[PDB]
Nucleic acid binder design. Structure first.
Lengths: 81, 98, 107, 91, 92, 104, 79, 98
DNA sequence: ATCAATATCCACCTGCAGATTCTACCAAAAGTGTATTTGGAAACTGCTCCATCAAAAGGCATGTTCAGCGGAATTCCGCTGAACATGCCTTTTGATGGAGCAGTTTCCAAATACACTTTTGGTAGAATCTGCAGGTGGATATTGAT
DNA sequence: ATCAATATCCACCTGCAGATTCTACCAAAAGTGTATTTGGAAACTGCTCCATCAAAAGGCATGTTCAGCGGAATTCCGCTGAACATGCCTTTTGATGGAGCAGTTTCCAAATACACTTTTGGTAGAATCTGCAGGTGGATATTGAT
């Protein structure tokens, strides 16, 4: 059973995302604040994605489902499956 | 022994990562987090691969974005280290609290 | 039997853009020039970004356009940047940009 | 259905020796269908705001003005008009 | 020039019988209804399209409500909705 | 009427008309207009109920835009649902950043 | 000059509704600039909705529709 | 000669204006600004009484909120005086620039 | 802690602008009954691709040590905004033509709707082509110690 | 500025993977061509409600004084970045069964399509009514000073 997979987003991966974000120096508290932010972000897209899946009486979340979900949030994504 | 002063490798890595475009989060770990959050919302749910990839594309896009704004609040503060309150300010003004 | 796309002098499918305007249920009726004008705009819009993507690629010694090229082309253009200010081009990266106060030394 | 072959023509038109990857073509497809839906909807709406049951080259033009930034809109209006005018006198 | 103003007035009374409402207030309530109507209609329209369907039925209306309204608000809005349909059907 | 058939103050028949003339779809089922109307009555009720309270609270009987504003923003959910809506003549909630108050 | 028509007292008042206690001198010309860029975006879209209808009169609905597209939905003037 | 101290009257003004709902900008100077900007878009225009109201209602509403975020950006930087750069940052983080 | 100036809160008074009550007219709903059409669920099922188990290997996460430096907190100072009383220049308010915003009638260019015939973009099947990913190496910067 | 340690650069070189290449099938498009319907431009017109302007009125500009705030320079203690050793778990290459998506045909409950009869929610003219916003009195909380 899947539990605590939020820790699967390693300090290293969060450090790399910040470099792209152009961040030079990071505080120790940042990593946990970020898991939180990423957690909420995902709970929101997947809820919607899954809501779309259910309405089509399917059992598989398709990329379209994620794509429609993102559009509903003003985070339109190009190029997907 | 040779040793770069603190922050040199960091600039090195900003330059580095801003040139590439590969996802910076381990795949399998991320997929688990997706499956977890999904199944603690509904069951018997399968995922197209590309579906988990769209979600990673978006998440990283979202986080890198957040980090630039966060990095800006810090410089406004005359700091170079993004702190939690920076993310909070950014997130708020961004319209996710506020 | 000339296509409408050629009648209009376009690469883009006027007949197709006309169907989609019906299946999209946007209004009771669709004028004849509606699809013609719209495929004209869509063609114009894709030629504009491709012009830029292609350049980005030349500047990258690459012959084939890839997502980062579309990304670099879109973010470097004021107007495309605004038109897609809420679109995320997957596998595109970001624009190299490091705040000044971060660089070392002085002057 | 895709816009791929059409994107390819134009592509070859601007850059005769350049190719496009599939992901890139994929994003170019997403792009087209996106602009297509915004202009459509802006048009659709405009008509209802005017108690008009028909979308025409005139709603499309306004939609294009409301949706596209500065210099792009100007040029897009031309292209649209030019094409309508041409197709108009061809039959 | 239609407006939900009279129906708004009805509802008001069932909730605050002694309470009245100024014009400007009543106009805001009108925009408010028109707004959610469009937001709900649109999402439903959209849902039918993604599923290549021709009809916007209450199933559509329902899901859209789940997508648009905040949790608990959505909870009741669904019940309310479901109840209204049940009543309408179970009627000669 | 249909509203009466479904037990509602809102105009089911009208809502139905508006769903057709709205070009939202080729066809409109019979429940949709009923279900939707139910939700508009309910949402309407929720806001009026809170704003009525806001009026009693300020010692007034007739509700004004300011009472719609106060009911909306002082409510996590409705405030979310109207997060990008500006209510004319509503004003803002009374709020002062603590750090700006005189040093007691 | 009209933009200068938006006065310091008026601007200082707005800021107060925003819970602002102390206002730097440079904020006023900065402010008018925001407002200028604001109106321009809205008014253009409204004037456009105006012309589409072939009117020589901007109607409050043309502003409401404008605002809706800017993502600034405004309840009070219909719709 | 009793005199109030810096910020005491302002604070009382905050209180004051957060209760009222009226426009804080005078109608005429504003109508003039709206008209001049419109003129650059289409000449010989006439504005409905309500159209100008809406625009004003929206502008103050807009400006007011921009002020709350600025105040927050000032406070984030251990200040209490909202400065230009404080507005600058807010608008950048709202996408009004990026 | 002690006055002394102001501001703020409150119980009450009352004209009036705007909310309410009443009648009447009415086209445009919205309800209702007939009968013709159809979307999409149900039932069978082909077939894509999702999950998942297996294994070998190094790309990378983890955890530790060390010290450079950046953030936090304290002090100090010049300059900048807040508060005020003076003063009048502009906005505000109530009135009066006429310009267009709409309500209505006309009628033709243009959009269904239907039946065919024709051209095509999608494609799955196989197979030849090619841009660059990624590995190598060694000449040119970038850095940091002295 | 010199010098040793490292990283960055970049042009040459080879190989798999993904792209450009065809043969033919072709349902579903898109085109062509009467026949029948109609939406909305176009010209005419009355009624609002908008632009203009006069003069009653309610704020704003202006100069002064100074309190206190932001910017600057300083100090120091702790926490984050660099460098390193170690070893695990992710990535990769493959294969298998079976779920559950998506295709195809059947076919009735539900929906569009008039057509007829009833009701009703919007408007316009008129009179009645009433919730509260400004207005006053007077007590009392708040603030700034000595």
């Amino acid at each position: 059973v899947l539990r605590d997979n939020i820790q699967g987003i390693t300090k290293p991966a969060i450090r790399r995302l910040a470099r792209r974000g152009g961040v030079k120096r990071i505080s120790g508290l940042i990593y946990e604040e970020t898991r939180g932010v990423l957690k909420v972000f995902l709970e929101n897209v997947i809820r919607d994605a899954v809501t779309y899946t259910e309405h089509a009486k399917r059992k598989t979340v398709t990329a379209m489902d994620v794509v429609y979900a993102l559009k509903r949030q003003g985070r339109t994504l190009y190029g997907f499956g | 022994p040779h040793r770069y002063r603190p922050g040199t490798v960091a600039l090195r890595e900003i330059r580095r990562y801003q040139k590439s475009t590969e996802l910076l989060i381990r795949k399998l770990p991320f997929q688990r987090l997706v499956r977890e959050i999904a199944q603690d919302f509904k069951t018997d749910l399968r995922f197209q691969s590309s579906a988990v990839m769209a979600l990673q594309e978006a998440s990283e896009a979202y986080l890198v974005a957040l980090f630039e704004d966060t990095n800006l609040c810090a410089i406004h503060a005359k700091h170079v280290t993004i702190m939690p309150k920076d993310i909070q300010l950014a997130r708020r003004i961004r319209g996710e609290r506020a | 039997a000339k296509t409408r796309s050629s009648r209009a002098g376009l690469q883009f499918p006027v007949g197709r853009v006309h169907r989609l305007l019906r299946k999209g249920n946007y209004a009771e009726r669709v004028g004849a020039g509606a699809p013609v004008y719209l495929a004209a705009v869509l063609e114009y819009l894709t030629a504009e970004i491709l012009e830029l993507a292609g350049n980005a690629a030349r500047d990258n010694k690459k012959t084939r356009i890839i997502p980062r090229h579309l990304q670099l082309a879109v973010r470097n253009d004021e107007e495309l940047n605004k038109l897609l200010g809420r679109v995320t081009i997957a596998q595109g990266g970001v624009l190299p940009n490091i705040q000044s106060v971060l660089l070392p030394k002085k002057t | 259905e895709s816009y791929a072959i059409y994107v390819y023509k134009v592509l070859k038109q601007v850059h005769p020796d350049t190719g496009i990857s599939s992901k890139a073509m994929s994003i170019m497809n997403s792009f087209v269908n996106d602009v297509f839906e915004r202009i459509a909807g802006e048009a659709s709406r405009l008509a209802h705001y005017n108690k008009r049951s028909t979308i025409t080259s005139r709603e499309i033009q306004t939609a294009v003005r409301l949706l596209l930034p500065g210099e792009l809109a100007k040029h897009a209006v031309s292209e649209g008009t030019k094409a309508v005018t041409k197709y108009t006198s061809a039959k």
